Design an enzyme around this catalytic site. Sequence first.
Site, mmCIF file in Angstrom:
data_model
loop_
_atom_site.group_PDB
_atom_site.id
_atom_site.type_symbol
_atom_site.label_atom_id
_atom_site.label_comp_id
_atom_site.label_asym_id
_atom_site.label_seq_id
_atom_site.Cartn_x
_atom_site.Cartn_y
_atom_site.Cartn_z
ATOM 1 N N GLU A 56 0.858 -1.223 0.000
ATOM 2 C CA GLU A 56 0.000 0.000 0.000
ATOM 3 C C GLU A 56 0.878 1.252 0.000
ATOM 4 O O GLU A 56 0.533 2.239 -0.681
ATOM 5 C CB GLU A 56 -0.922 -0.018 1.200
ATOM 6 C CG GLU A 56 -2.009 -1.056 1.103
ATOM 7 C CD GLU A 56 -3.088 -0.740 0.090
ATOM 8 O OE1 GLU A 56 -3.020 0.329 -0.561
ATOM 9 O OE2 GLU A 56 -3.946 -1.641 -0.126
ATOM 10 N N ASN A 98 -7.898 9.291 -5.506
ATOM 11 C CA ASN A 98 -8.771 8.354 -6.263
ATOM 12 C C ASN A 98 -9.625 9.118 -7.283
ATOM 13 O O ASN A 98 -9.811 10.324 -7.152
ATOM 14 C CB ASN A 98 -9.625 7.537 -5.313
ATOM 15 C CG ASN A 98 -8.802 6.803 -4.281
ATOM 16 O OD1 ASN A 98 -7.889 6.094 -4.657
ATOM 17 N ND2 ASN A 98 -9.115 6.963 -3.017
ATOM 18 N N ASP A 109 -12.713 9.068 -7.750
ATOM 19 C CA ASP A 109 -13.996 9.561 -7.167
ATOM 20 C C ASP A 109 -13.774 10.848 -6.351
ATOM 21 O O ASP A 109 -14.769 11.396 -5.836
ATOM 22 C CB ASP A 109 -14.694 8.458 -6.381
ATOM 23 C CG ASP A 109 -14.010 8.077 -5.088
ATOM 24 O OD1 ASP A 109 -12.897 8.597 -4.820
ATOM 25 O OD2 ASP A 109 -14.567 7.263 -4.371
ATOM 26 N N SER A 111 -11.950 10.997 -3.580
ATOM 27 C CA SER A 111 -11.450 10.596 -2.247
ATOM 28 C C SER A 111 -9.927 10.440 -2.305
ATOM 29 O O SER A 111 -9.319 10.458 -3.361
ATOM 30 C CB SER A 111 -12.093 9.327 -1.745
ATOM 31 O OG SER A 111 -11.717 8.249 -2.557
ATOM 32 N N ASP A 131 -6.510 8.325 -0.273
ATOM 33 C CA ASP A 131 -6.003 7.299 0.651
ATOM 34 C C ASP A 131 -4.784 7.808 1.418
ATOM 35 O O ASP A 131 -3.948 8.502 0.811
ATOM 36 C CB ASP A 131 -5.602 6.047 -0.126
ATOM 37 C CG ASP A 131 -6.702 5.444 -0.947
ATOM 38 O OD1 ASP A 131 -7.819 5.536 -0.566
ATOM 39 O OD2 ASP A 131 -6.368 4.737 -1.903
ATOM 40 N N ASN A 161 -9.041 5.178 3.279
ATOM 41 C CA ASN A 161 -9.746 6.070 2.335
ATOM 42 C C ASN A 161 -10.681 7.049 3.026
ATOM 43 O O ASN A 161 -11.441 6.660 3.920
ATOM 44 C CB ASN A 161 -10.505 5.222 1.331
ATOM 45 C CG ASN A 161 -11.113 6.021 0.214
ATOM 46 O OD1 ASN A 161 -10.436 6.426 -0.726
ATOM 47 N ND2 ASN A 161 -12.394 6.257 0.314
ATOM 48 N N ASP A 212 -15.354 -4.999 9.400
ATOM 49 C CA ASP A 212 -16.507 -4.381 8.679
ATOM 50 C C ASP A 212 -17.280 -5.433 7.869
ATOM 51 O O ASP A 212 -18.458 -5.156 7.520
ATOM 52 C CB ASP A 212 -16.030 -3.249 7.767
ATOM 53 C CG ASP A 212 -17.126 -2.388 7.168
ATOM 54 O OD1 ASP A 212 -17.989 -1.941 7.949
ATOM 55 O OD2 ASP A 212 -17.090 -2.168 5.918
#
Length: 129
Positions: free
Chosen positions: A35, A46, A48, A50, A52, A59, A101
């Site tokens: 990562e 990203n 969209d 967003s 990270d 995110n 989650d």
Amino acid sequence: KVFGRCELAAAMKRHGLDNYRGYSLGNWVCAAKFESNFNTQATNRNTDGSTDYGILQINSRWWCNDGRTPGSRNLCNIPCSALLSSDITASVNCAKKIVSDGNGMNAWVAWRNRCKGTDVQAWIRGCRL
Ligand SMILES: [Cl-]
Ligand SMILES: [Cl-]
Ligand SMILES: [Cl-]
Ligand SMILES: [Cl-]
Ligand SMILES: [Cl-]
Ligand SMILES: [Cl-]
Ligand SMILES: [Cl-]
Ligand code: NA
């Protein structure tokens, strides 16, 4: 901060990630390598809108507040900047929420594509733990 491999394994063990939700320490070290290359200050934007953040690329669409991700949530209740600290506590505490989650470590695309099903114990080989 750019961690060493064993340095990060030790830090993650001290913060209770070894076998957290059944994921052995090498899974977490492998995820951090691919990562962020073990760099707490890693950021990536990203499509969209967003972003990270940090060693585990957490995110802003769901997990932290950066003030520039419209309609997003802040489920870890932290500013995204906390995830870039030399102190991994905030990243670890938020990763524990994420892996709880429902999709486990599949939430991390680099873990699914580069760590899952590999010899992840290799990532902690040789380390004093
Ligand atoms: Cl390495
Ligand atoms: Cl392991
Ligand atoms: Cl926002
Ligand atoms: Cl929220
Ligand atoms: Cl905030
Ligand atoms: Cl730390
Ligand atoms: Cl799982
Ligand atoms: Na957010």
